[PDB]
Amino acid sequence: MAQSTVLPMHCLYGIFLEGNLKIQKNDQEGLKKFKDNIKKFTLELDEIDKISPQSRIGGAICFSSDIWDTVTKKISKPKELKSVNTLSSYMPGTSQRDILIHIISDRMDTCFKLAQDTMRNFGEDQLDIKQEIHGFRRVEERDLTDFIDGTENPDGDELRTQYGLVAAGQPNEFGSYVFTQRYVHNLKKWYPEPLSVQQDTVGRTKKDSIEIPRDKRPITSHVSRTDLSENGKDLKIVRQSLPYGQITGEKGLMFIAYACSLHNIEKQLQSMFGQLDGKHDLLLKYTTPVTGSFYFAPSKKELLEL
Amino acid sequence: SMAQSTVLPMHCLYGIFLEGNLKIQKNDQEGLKKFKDNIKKFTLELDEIDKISPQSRIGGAICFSSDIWDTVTKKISKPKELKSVNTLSSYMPGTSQRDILIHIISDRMDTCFKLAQDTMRNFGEDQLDIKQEIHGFRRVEERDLTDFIDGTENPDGDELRTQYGLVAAGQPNEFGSYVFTQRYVHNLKKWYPEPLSVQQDTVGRTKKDSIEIPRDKRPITSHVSRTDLSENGKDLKIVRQSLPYGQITGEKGLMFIAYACSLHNIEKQLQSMFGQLDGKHDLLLKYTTPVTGSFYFAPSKKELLEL
Ligand code: HEM
Ligand code: HEM
Ligand code: NA
Ligand code: NA
Ligand code: NA
């Protein structure tokens, strides 16, 4: 019932296309063509899945709060959706765009085919793409800090539905709130740090990703900043982030999270960027966010009913 | 009796291309010793990745220009045909001769990137000044971004790829290879609207199945007519390992690379494509532009370790 980037795990490739919609609010012919291109996307996902099951292909189209009432008069706007630019007073790099296309695959050739076919369908007359990122998994699923990324991601369809998708029975059920944020790593500053400093920074051991006990790591360790609870309930999220970039140039982490509630993501951002106790995440000494956007990925049904 | 491991294998899904200049000076014997230690580490890490990830079909080569040859070795004789590609600048655009090429191929990006990253960390910025890093990837049906299949007439199998790709046994520098790299930027806004008949006239094969257009029905300036060359009844075949690269919404094209037993096999095709043989240019050059270019020699594994 959901679009197909939230529940599956361990993709090897991801393509991220973020940009703005060029169709105006009352161009009904252009908006009909735009929705025909959305339909073609969902059909091509199915066709690639049938021909290349080994790809474990997945894809989602997601919309910002600012563009919501341009693309639909029928579906109610998700209750928590807002522009990420409202965080610009404390979080650098915000760059809210209208549209996200996120495609995942275990093969680059099918990842790229769907991304390219989709962009050719929409065309430069409908989409103004501001960012295109080719993410790829590294050996042992390590981020470029060379720590394993993903250890405490929720596992399995049951938990990833609970934390990644709007609950059944609620408005916009089986959609997801989405946050994207491109980080540029400063590995020249990170590599010389002793293992003890690197593990204090993250909050887990480097070789095996064993959690360091809460009382033995700083409260500004990354795990202490992001493992948060409210009213005895964990504010978990579903991350699909991947490394990207050039060995001899700019590189980092293309962060993306899917969540049942935007609050689960935003409270972690308040924590990491010093807005809850005046202290920043230790990881931010070594990496910098340079883009940012909030979106909502509708359910498959609402995507086709816009 | 072993070549470096990027010439003979076929159908890689990923390739990383690192091209740049050597910062070690001819007299710096301690620096050259460390440079050669890092070369040995590259050959050892290739073996280790092959052991741990046989599914990657990993391959790698380090290749040297004629300008840098006598800096890196006093012992191995310079390959007799090697020269700088900048000597072609009077007729071929985009020449940019560099000292060193590192070419890594894999069926998985994670092991491709691991070897490339580890290798660049070993050499470091104080030894290598990298001018270009390209992440190539195979597309569905092995099509170039023109959406024609690329590779139909590449030689198949170890025997023919040894014949056309490697210096012959018994010759100086046996089992090394002459190498040519050239990055192309495609003008797909210009190419996409062209009628199918124009596209097939340009390449010289059919788009759907890569069936050769009969010679009598295709232009002498078609790409296949320009590159299918012979001399004294012998075909001047080469071993291509080119891959697409780039951004859907930005700059994209083909990262061209060829390996050959003789630089002449490559250079005569360049003379053909760029108008030096008969004044006529390859039709493909109306839709794509070369923006880098370099000639190198990839030594045999033995000569690589004995520089
Ligand atoms: C440079 C950017 C980032 C890097 C390199 C990074 C890396 C990591 C690593 C290594 C872990 C530990 C392994 C794991 O459990 O996954 C982790 C955990 C986590 N990260 Fe990040 N992360 C980054 C940014 C973010 C951001 C922006 C958020 C939230 C919006 C986030 C949320 C989390 C969460 C929720 C966990 C799991 C915490 C737990 O319950 O134990 N991370 N991250
Ligand atoms: C934009 C750059 C280029 C593109 C898109 C391109 C594309 C192609 C295509 C589609 C084919 C036909 C299928 C095949 O047999 O592989 C082909 C054949 C070939 N290409 Fe290229 N090519 C390019 C540049 C070059 C260059 C620079 C050379 C030589 C240095 C070269 C040498 C060849 C050769 C030798 C063949 C096979 C000819 C035969 O014996 O039938 N190509 N190329
Ligand atoms: Na692939
Ligand atoms: Na792979
Ligand atoms: Na590239």
DSSP state letter for B217: G
Please check if B103 is assigned to a binding site.
Answer: no
Under an 8 Å CB criterion, which residues of A touch B? 12-13, 17, 107-110, 112-113, 115-116, 119, 129, 132, 134, 136-139, 246-249
| A132 contacts B247? CB cut-off 8 A | yes
Q: Would you call B246 exposed, middle or buried from its count of C-beta atoms within 10 A (0-12, 13-18, 19+)?
A: buried
**Contacts of A222 by beta carbon, 8 Å cutoff, 6+ apart:** A201, A202, A203, A272, A281, A282, A283
Residue of A149, A155, A157, A227 marked catalytic: A149
* Residue B55 CB neighbour total at 10 angstroms: 10
Nearest to B250 among A115, A132, A136 (CB): A132
Ligand nearest to the CA of B238: 2
| CB-closest option in A113, A119, A132 to B139 | A113
Q: Is B106 in contact with B56 (CB distance < 8 Å)? A: yes
Residue B270 to residue B291: CA distance in whole angstroms? 14
Three-state helix/strand/coil letters over chain A: CCCCCCCCCCCCEEEEEEEEECCCCCCHHHHHHHHHHHHHHHHHHHHHHHHCHHHCCEEEEEECCCCHHHHCCCCCCCCCCCCHHHHCCCCCCCCCCCEEEEEEECCHHHHHHHHHHHHHHHCCCCEEEEEEEEEECCHHHECCCCCECCCCCCCHHHHHHHHHCCCCCCCCCCCEEEEEEEEEECHHHHCCCCHHHHHHHHCECCCCCCECCHHHCCCCCHHHHHCCEECCEECCCEECCEEEECCCCCEEEEEEEEECCHHHHHHHHHHHECCCCCCECHHHHCEEECCCEEEEECCHHHHHCC
Q: Phi/psi of residue A187, each to 5°?
A: -70, -25
Determine the structural domain holding residue A201 and report its residue range: 1-306
Tokens of A34: 């735009």
Residues B285, B87 contacting (CB under 8 angstroms): no
Whole-angstrom CA distances from A75 to A70, A102, B14, B85 are 11, 21, 43, 61
Residue B18, judged by CB atoms within 10 A of its CB (0-12, 13-18, 19+), counts as: buried
Q: What tokens does B95 get?
A: 């020449």
Structure-block tokens of residue B159: 């025997």
Residues in chain A, total: 306
Query: If DSSP codes are grouped into helix, strand and coil, which group holds residue B251?
Result: coil
- Three-state secondary structure string covering B22-90: ECCCCCCHHHHHHHHHHHHHHHHHHHHHHHHCHHHCCEEEEEECCCCHHHHCCCCCCCCCCCCHHHHCC
Our mutation pick for probing the ligand 1 site, out of A90, A94, A149, A160, counting the most ligand atoms within 8 A of Cβ, is A149
Catalytic, A143? Answer no
Are the C-beta atoms of residues A17 and A115 closer than 8 Å to each other?
yes
Quote the DSSP letter at residue B127: T
Question: What is the gyration radius of the CA atoms in chain B, in angstroms?
Answer: 19
* Chain A interface, best mutation among B18, B112, B140, by max A CB count within 10 A: B140
Chain A residues within 8 A of B139 when measuring between CB atoms: 109, 112-113
Beta strand A176-185 with A13-21 is: unpaired
The annotation status of B11 as a binding-site residue, yes or no, is no
Atom of ligand 1 nearest to the CA of A211: 41
**DSSP secondary structure code for residue B139 in this structure:** P
> Where do runs of H (alpha helix) occur along B166-291?
188-191, 196-203, 223-227, 263-273
The tokens 């928590």 sit on which residue?
A: A80
| Closest residue by Cα to residue A160 from A147, A180, A176 | A176
Measure the CA–CA gap between B126 and B24, rounded to whole angstroms. Answer: 8
Q: Facing residues of B16 across strands?
A: B104, B135
Beta bridge partners, A280, equal: A273
Side-chain-facing half-sphere of B45: CA atoms under 13 Å: 21
Number of domains forming the structure of chain A:
1
- Best CA proximity match to B89, nearest among B284, B237, B290, B258: B290
User: With 0-12 CB in 10 A as exposed, 13-18 as middle and 19+ as buried, what is B120?
Assistant: buried
Ligand 4 centroid–CA B275 distance in Å is: 41
For residue B189 the two structure tokens come to 């806004």
Dist CA A100 CA A84 (whole Å): 14
Closest B-chain CA to A243: B110
CB B267 near ligand 2, within 6 Å: no
Of A12, A109, A129, nearest to B140 by CB-CB distance is A109
Distance CA B160, CA B152 (A): 15
Q: Which of A255, A256, A285 to mutate to test the pocket of ligand 1 (most atoms within 8 A of CB)?
A: A255
Distance, CA of B74 to CA of B85 (rounded, Å)? 23
- Judge contact between B31 and B127, C-beta under 8 A: yes
A222 is in an annotated binding site: yes
- Asked if the Cβ–Cβ distance from A139 to B111 is below 8 Å, we say yes
Q: Which residues contact B27 (CB under 8 A, 6 or more apart)?
A: none
Assess contact for A83 and A64: CB atoms under 8 A: yes
A136 Cα to chain B: minimum distance (Å): 7
Contact between B65 and B294 under an 8 Å Cβ cutoff? The reply is yes
The answer to whether the CB atoms of A139 and B114 lie below 8 A apart is: yes
Q: What are phi and psi of B20, to 5 degrees?
A: -175, -170
Q: Is A204:A147 a contact under the CB 8 Å cutoff?
A: yes
- Give the pair of three-digit tokens for residue B161: 């790829």
Give the CA count within 13 Å in the CB-facing half-sphere of B145. Answer: 30
CB B149 within 8 A of CB B257: no
Place of tokens 């740049």: B20
**What's B306's DSSP letter?**
T
Residues of chain B contacting A137 with CB distance shorter than 8 Å: 109-110
**Separation of alpha carbons B174 and B300, rounded Å:** 7
Q: State yes or no: A34 annotated in a binding site.
A: no
Q: Hey, how many other C-beta atoms are within 10 angstroms of the C-beta on B70?
A: 11
